[PDB]
Design a binder for this molecule. Structure first.
Ligand SMILES: NCCC[C@H](N)C(=O)O
Length: 406
């Protein structure tokens, strides 16, 4: 028996479906074809047209030899073409390796080499900056040429990678984090069952594809058919102008970090959902923003367990914590020798559930050191603990408390 020292999210086995990312998008495109998916300044793209164009690109990728399981790099400016190329890689059954706008070419080369990628997509302009990159470089423009014959795309499977994250800005040994199709489809359903992004929402898209939170901006939206407002690079660094733009554009969903939100001059009343990740929200910020017409959330979780692992509804005057695990996620605490600690003792925080990553690409050493068997799995989806390296304790209310690094 005995709970108290193992904390589980809500039980929702229906969030585990026999699906891949392409399935989620194709469903949305087929049921809402004329609905606007992407808007970039003045340009609008519907889900139907987005799906058709991404499909042309995926067929070109298949002609050039990319198959489910392959890894394709992605390096384009913020905007519609970037998301289209992401989706193109996805529809081909491959997984994409996203690169931030400011990734130096030599880092790109190092990461493509480490991932054993089959190539990457970039723009015409940026192709030149890639002389040092040995790997095959395809341009979006080239991949959107009219097709001669229909190129039948083979489907990937849940066990295959959906995307590989090389931590953006790392200068040390490349560490590729392999997120599977299963991981990310589960996450999308699990977190949205609480966030509740809906088709009629218009969601700000201000994150670089190299960051976890871009998924909450992008794929949560794809999940229900919401509209994305893609931020230009110029706006990303102007908080007062952003605060104004969100008003004028009637944005209903903001995913952001707390330091950005604190720099907003005034309230943005029309904001239905505010999802703060990356840092624990300060209390002054909650006091200012946890207003009645705002659903304000604080999400926590390492990249190694797909985007987020816990979430909390934050409330004026209630101390900010990391909240409860997302549905089907679980957290427990261990000691130096990988032993389950009693409730209240301080140890390393570990995460389990269907969204634990596959591991670190090509590094069985580190992977086995950080992804350990879960002696206490009450189910096959719980057999793998990820060791965050954070110290934590479970308090007398069944709540997890971070206490820094180990
Ligand atoms: N939903 C955001 C959680 C924190 C994020 N995975 C990060 O690594 O910053």
């Amino acid at each position: 028996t005995n709970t108290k020292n193992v904390i589980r999210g809500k039980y929702h086995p229906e969030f585990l479906q026999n699906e891949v990312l392409a399935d989620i998008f194709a469903h949305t495109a087929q049921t809402l074809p004329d609905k606007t998916a992407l808007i970039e300044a003045d340009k609008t793209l519907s889900y139907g047209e987005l799906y058709q164009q991404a499909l042309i690109m995926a067929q070109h990728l298949a002609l050039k030899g990319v198959k489910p399981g392959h890894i394709v790099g992605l390096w384009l400016p913020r905007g519609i073409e970037l998301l289209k190329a992401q989706l193109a890689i996805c529809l081909s059954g491959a997984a994409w390796l996203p690169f931030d706008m400011d990734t130096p070419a030599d880092r790109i080369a190092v990461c493509l080499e480490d991932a054993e990628a089959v190539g990457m997509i970039t723009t015409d302009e940026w192709y030149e900056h890639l002389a040092e990159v040995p790997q095959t470089k395809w341009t979006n423009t080239e991949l959107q040429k009219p097709l001669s014959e229909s190129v039948s795309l083979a489907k990937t499977t849940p066990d295959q990678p959906a995307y590989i994250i090389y931590t953006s800005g790392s200068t040390g040994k490349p560490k590729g984090i392999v997120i599977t199709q299963k991981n990310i489809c589960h996450f999308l359903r699990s977190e949205n069952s609480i966030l509740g992004i809906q088709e009629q929402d218009k969601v700000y898209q201000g994150f670089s594809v190299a960051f976890d939170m871009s998924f909450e901006e992008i794929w949560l939206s794809y999940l229900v058919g919401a509209t994305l407002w893609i931020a230009p690079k110029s706006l990303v660094s102007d908080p007062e102008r952003l605060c104004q733009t969100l008003k004028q554009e009637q944005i209903t969903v903001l995913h952001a970090v707390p330091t950005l939100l604190a720099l907003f001059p005034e309230d943005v009343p029309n904001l239905r959902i505010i999802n703060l990740g990356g840092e624990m929200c300060p209390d002054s910020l909650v006091d200012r923003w946890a207003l009645p017409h705002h659903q304000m959330f604080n999400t926590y979780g390492p990249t190694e367990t797909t985007v987020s692992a816990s979430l909390e509804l934050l409330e004026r005057g209630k101390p900010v914590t990391i909240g409860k695990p997302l549905p089907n996620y679980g957290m427990l605490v261990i000691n130096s020798e990988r032993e389950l600690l009693e409730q209240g003792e301080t140890g390393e925080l570990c995460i389990f559930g269907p969204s634990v990553a596959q591991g670190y690409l090509g590094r069985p050493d580190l992977t086995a050191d950080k992804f350990i068997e879960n002696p206490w799995a009450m189910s096959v989806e719980e057999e793998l603990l990820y060791r965050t390296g954070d110290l934590a304790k479970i308090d007398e209310f069944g709540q997890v408390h971070c206490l820094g690094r180990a």
